[PDB]
Amino acid sequence: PQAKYRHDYRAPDYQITDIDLTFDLDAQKTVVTAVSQAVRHGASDAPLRLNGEDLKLVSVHINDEPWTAWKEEEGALVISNLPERFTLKIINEISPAANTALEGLYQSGDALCTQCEAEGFRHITYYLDRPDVLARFTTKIIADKIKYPFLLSNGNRVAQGELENGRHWVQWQDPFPKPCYLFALVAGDFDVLRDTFTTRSGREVALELYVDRGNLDRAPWAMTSLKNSMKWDEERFGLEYDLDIYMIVAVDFFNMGAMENKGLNIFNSKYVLARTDTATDKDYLDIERVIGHEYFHNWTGNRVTCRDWFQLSLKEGLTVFRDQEFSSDLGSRAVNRINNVRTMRGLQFAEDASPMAHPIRPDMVIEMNNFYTLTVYEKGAEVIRMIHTLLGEENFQKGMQLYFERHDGSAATCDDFVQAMEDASNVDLSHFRRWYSQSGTPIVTVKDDYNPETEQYTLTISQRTPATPDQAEKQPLHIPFAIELYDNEGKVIPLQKGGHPVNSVLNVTQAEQTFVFDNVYFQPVPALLCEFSAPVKLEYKWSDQQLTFLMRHARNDFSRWDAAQSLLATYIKLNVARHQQGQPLSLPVHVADAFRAVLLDEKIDPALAAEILTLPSVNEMAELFDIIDPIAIAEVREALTRTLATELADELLAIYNANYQSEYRVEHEDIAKRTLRNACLRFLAFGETHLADVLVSKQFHEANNMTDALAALSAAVAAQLPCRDALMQEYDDKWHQNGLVMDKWFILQATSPAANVLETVRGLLQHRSFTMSNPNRIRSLIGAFAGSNPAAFHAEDGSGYLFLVEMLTDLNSRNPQVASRLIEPLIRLKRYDAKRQEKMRAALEQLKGLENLSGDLYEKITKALA
Numbered sequence: 001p002q003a004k005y006r007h008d009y010r011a012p013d014y015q016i017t018d019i020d021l022t023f024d025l026d027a028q029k030t031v032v033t034a035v036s037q038a039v040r041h042g043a044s045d046a047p048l049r050l051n052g053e054d055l056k057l058v059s060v061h062i063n064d065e066p067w068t069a070w071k072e073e074e075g076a077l078v079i080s081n082l083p084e085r086f087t088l089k090i091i092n093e094i095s096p097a098a099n100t101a102l103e104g105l106y107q108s109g110d111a112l113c114t115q116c117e118a119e120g121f122r123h124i125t126y127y128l129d130r131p132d133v134l135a136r137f138t139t140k141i142i143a144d145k146i147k148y149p150f151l152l153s154n155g156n157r158v159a160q161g162e163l164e165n166g167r168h169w170v171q172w173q174d175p176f177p178k179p180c181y182l183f184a185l186v187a188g189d190f191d192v193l194r195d196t197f198t199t200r201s202g203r204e205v206a207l208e209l210y211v212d213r214g215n216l217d218r219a220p221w222a223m224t225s226l227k228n229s230m231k232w233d234e235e236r237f238g239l240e241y242d243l244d245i246y247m248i249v250a251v252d253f254f255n256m257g258a259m260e261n262k263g264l265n266i267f268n269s270k271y272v273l274a275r276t277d278t279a280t281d282k283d284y285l286d287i288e289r290v291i292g293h294e295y296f297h298n299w300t301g302n303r304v305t306c307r308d309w310f311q312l313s314l315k316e317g318l319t320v321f322r323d324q325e326f327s328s329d330l331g332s333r334a335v336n337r338i339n340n341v342r343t344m345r346g347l348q349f350a351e352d353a354s355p356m357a358h359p360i361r362p363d364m365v366i367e368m369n370n371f372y373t374l375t376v377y378e379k380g381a382e383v384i385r386m387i388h389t390l391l392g393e394e395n396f397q398k399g400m401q402l403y404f405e406r407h408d409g410s411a412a413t414c415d416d417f418v419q420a421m422e423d424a425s426n427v428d429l430s431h432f433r434r435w436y437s438q439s440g441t442p443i444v445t446v447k448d449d450y451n452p453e454t455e456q457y458t459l460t461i462s463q464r465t466p467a468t469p470d471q472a473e474k475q476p477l478h479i480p481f482a483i484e485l486y487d488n489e490g491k492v493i494p495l496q497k498g499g500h501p502v503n504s505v506l507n508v509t510q511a512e513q514t515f516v517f518d519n520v521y522f523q524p525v526p527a528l529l530c531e532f533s534a535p536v537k538l539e540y541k542w543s544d545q546q547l548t549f550l551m552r553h554a555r556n557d558f559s560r561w562d563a564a565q566s567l568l569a570t571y572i573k574l575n576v577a578r579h580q581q582g583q584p585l586s587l588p589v590h591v592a593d594a595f596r597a598v599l600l601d602e603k604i605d606p607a608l609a610a611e612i613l614t615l616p617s618v619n620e621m622a623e624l625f626d627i628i629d630p631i632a633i634a635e636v637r638e639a640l641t642r643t644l645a646t647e648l649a650d651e652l653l654a655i656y657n658a659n660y661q662s663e664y665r666v667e668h669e670d671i672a673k674r675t676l677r678n679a680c681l682r683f684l685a686f687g688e689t690h691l692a693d694v695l696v697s698k699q700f701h702e703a704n705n706m707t708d709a710l711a712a713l714s715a716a717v718a719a720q721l722p723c724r725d726a727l728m729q730e731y732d733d734k735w736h737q738n739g740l741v742m743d744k745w746f747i748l749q750a751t752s753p754a755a756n757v758l759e760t761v762r763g764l765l766q767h768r769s770f771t772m773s774n775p776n777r778i779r780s781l782i783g784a785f786a787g788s789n790p791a792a793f794h795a796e797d798g799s800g801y802l803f804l805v806e807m808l809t810d811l812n813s814r815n816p817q818v819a820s821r822l823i824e825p826l827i828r829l830k831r832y833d834a835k836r837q838e839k840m841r842a843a844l845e846q847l848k849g850l851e852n853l854s855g856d857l858y859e860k861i862t863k864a865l866a
């Protein structure tokens with residue numbers, strides 16, 4: 001299993017311009033006939049080297065001549081002595097039924113469907129499976145009519161027929177040249193929700209959502225979100241859809257969230273199906289964002305694609321930026337930003353310090369499916385956001401316009417995109433490019449000085465990025481460092497120097513620099529790194545009062561939330577050290593009072609209050625520490641919850657009651673009120689036991705929507721309340737036939753604070769709603785245990801590790817992509833104490849020694865054991 005390197009990129013020796021596919025479909029044996037029009041660009045004597053994996057080759061012809069000058073090697077069909085232009089015809093067989101990895105053509109229940117990204121099409125036929133080869137596809141699909149009455153591929157229907165013996169066929173053509181990773185095929189029996197969207201220029205688009213028979217009741221929100229996405233891309237980016245039909249198919253068996261195949265997106269049904277009794281507000285907004293994301297790819301990914309897979313962030317950073325902007329414009333910008341920042345600081349920063357650390361544009365890759373990462377996606381988006389901060393919206397949209405004008409219809413690089421932005425805007429991004437090539441999280445240290453004699457305020461700012469396992473050398477970045485300065489009354493002080501305004505985005509470009517501001521009439525309280533203006537750790541010595549001041553006065557809701565996080569961080573760290581010495585929680589009264597004030601402030605947006613009243617996750621808390629003590633973190637989180645619930649009990653109950661809503665709606669104001677009310681409930685669950693039990697049980701039984709029901713259920717679990725077992729059993733009895741709804745319950749089981757959680761989780765491997773064959777079930781029971789219950793996962797006896805080894809031993813052979821996401825908690829070993837490291841290292845060594853170790857796991861294990 002050999003690494004590939006970004007610096008080895010070279011243009012292909014051959015292009016394929018047009019490919020005509022025929023599939024004779026059957027679950028046990030599918031026959032694929034692929035006719036490709038090829039053109040040699042390289043040297044006359046260069047062979048054509050086609051990728052192929054797990055294919056039974058039947059025949060190879062070149063301009064209808066059966067070919068002799070070829071050989072099959074590991075992963076390849078190498079064809080020699082070719083003309084400059086020719087027709088390649090390959091026939092091969094594949095077996096969808098055998099495909100447990102869900103890569104290429106496989107079964108999802110009784111349907112047949114595909115996943116081709118990154119390198120899945122080579123599991124369907126021998127091809128130039130690289131994204132700089134763009135070809136016009138036509139696809140003919142032949143199958144049993146009764147089993148597969150819908151035969152779908154990319155584009156428009158151009159032919160159809162019926163055959164003997166109950167078989168029929170449909171042929172598709174997609175006029176836009178595409179890399180094969182955007183190829184899709186679906187065959188099966190579906191219900192279909194049909195609607196239309198008319199673009200601003202008048203193009204009428206047929207919209208078609210394919211779902212399992214009986215799920216039409218759960219389709220309209222996804223349809224609505226598709227229309228919303230299309231309207232927003234027109235309004236915000238000036239982009240219209242480019243075809244006549246937009247098909248989405250919801251499948252139950254899917255490794256990823258969803259996939260942007262041109263005109264034929266395939267979605268994990270988790271990101272399509274919603275009804276108010278099955279899906280929470282969070283599920284609705286996740287459906288919205290994922291529908292949006294895949295739609296947005298139509299331009300940022302499909303009309304301009306990636307030259308090579310090292311450029312993955314070109315499409316994923318930018319499309320995630322777009323989906324954040326969509327969510328943020330339609331809903332709560334603050335809540336979106338807060339949550340994306342929680343992901344960055346609490347999950348992405350952990351990756352960037354891990355053995356799998358990489359730059360957003362990686363340099364070295366063994367298995368490309370391991371690089372669909374928090375770094376490439378979330379940090380990628382923060383990098384795009386920095387360009388947006390640096391340029392402003394108008395210049396940023398100029399750069400988008402120049403990027404498409406230059407690269408529409410082509411496969412481009414990250415560097416191309418930066419250059420478009422630089423050239424359209426006239427902002428120099430030469431230094432900024434280092435964000436693409438350097439891994440690790442910068443640490444920005446800020447000191448300040450106020451000089452009352454000159455009425456000057458000086459910020460002394462320094463940066464450094466620690467070495468990471470992948471890179472021994474680090475250099476300063478171009479860090480956009482947004483500030484705001486507050487006077488004694490909470491009014492913003494104008495930034496100026498030497499009689500001229502100073503932009504509030506400071507260009508932090510050196511290891512150390514000073515910024516001086518004049519006409520500073522009063523010693524300021526600064527708001528620093530406003531709206532998380534760069535993806536960096538900030539070191540500033542905040543007083544508690546400065547932070548509670550920001551919580552009361554800061555102009556941007558994000559700053560209020562961020563000040564609350566810094567206030568809490570001090571006391572989370574305090575109490576973890578106390579826990580380790582056997583001492584109980586200590587919290588100053590004035591800290592509790594700051595959160596009391598948030599609860600009682602009628603002018604604060606309830607969306608914001610809810611977030612201030614949501615404590616950092618155990619993952620976010622881990623980032624605060626040089627060495628992670630997951631048991632101390634978990635216990636402190638609970639103790640803090642309990643302490644706040646006791647101190648704020650009256651106020652909590654008052655606000656809980658005030659935000660009661662008898663109507664359920666999926667509307668942002670309503671969602672914000674529910675989030676507040678349920679943030680209150682979480683604390684109240686940890687108050688006096690009898691009142692808690694009654695309140696929680698009543699909300700579960702009386703809820704008219706899954707948001708409120710699950711919030712109660714989840715609090716019964718979190719607080720180990722008396723009603724917990726009865727409510728958990730009620731939910732199983734009602735919902736066990738519905739895997740998506742049971743995922744929520746598997747997550748609660750996996751994240752339970754109960755002493756016997758591992759025993760329960762193992763027992764649920766045999767539950768009626770669980771199956772090892774379904775990625776969502778795996779992720780919900782097993783992934784949630786390992787990733788979201790680190791206290792149990794990291795049980796001192798090593799039992800969590802042993803359990804993960806067993807599961808991984810199965811998944812390594814069944815579904816390497818799912819296995820590789822699941823191993824991630826084990827690769828963080830060097831963050832833990834020595835005895836945990838020894839046990840985790842022993843587990844990794846066991847997996848290293850597996851017969852038939854997948855490349856997916858091999859890459860991660862080798863980095864971890866280094």
Ligand SMILES: CCCCC[C@H](CC(=O)NO)C(=O)N[C@H](C(=O)N1CCC[C@H]1CO)C(C)C
Pocket residue numbers: 255256257258259260289290293294297316323372373374377
């Ligand atoms: C809003 C965009 C996110 C959904 C889609 C992406 C895939 C993609 O980029 N499609 O264009 C995805 O699956 N992402 C992964 C993900 O969200 N997954 C993977 C398994 C299911 C789902 C939730 O964990 C992460 C972990 C990279």
Ligand code: NA
Pocket residue numbers: 022023024031032033
């Ligand atoms: Na065929």
Ligand SMILES: [Zn+2]
Pocket residue numbers: 293297315316319
């Ligand atoms: Zn994407």
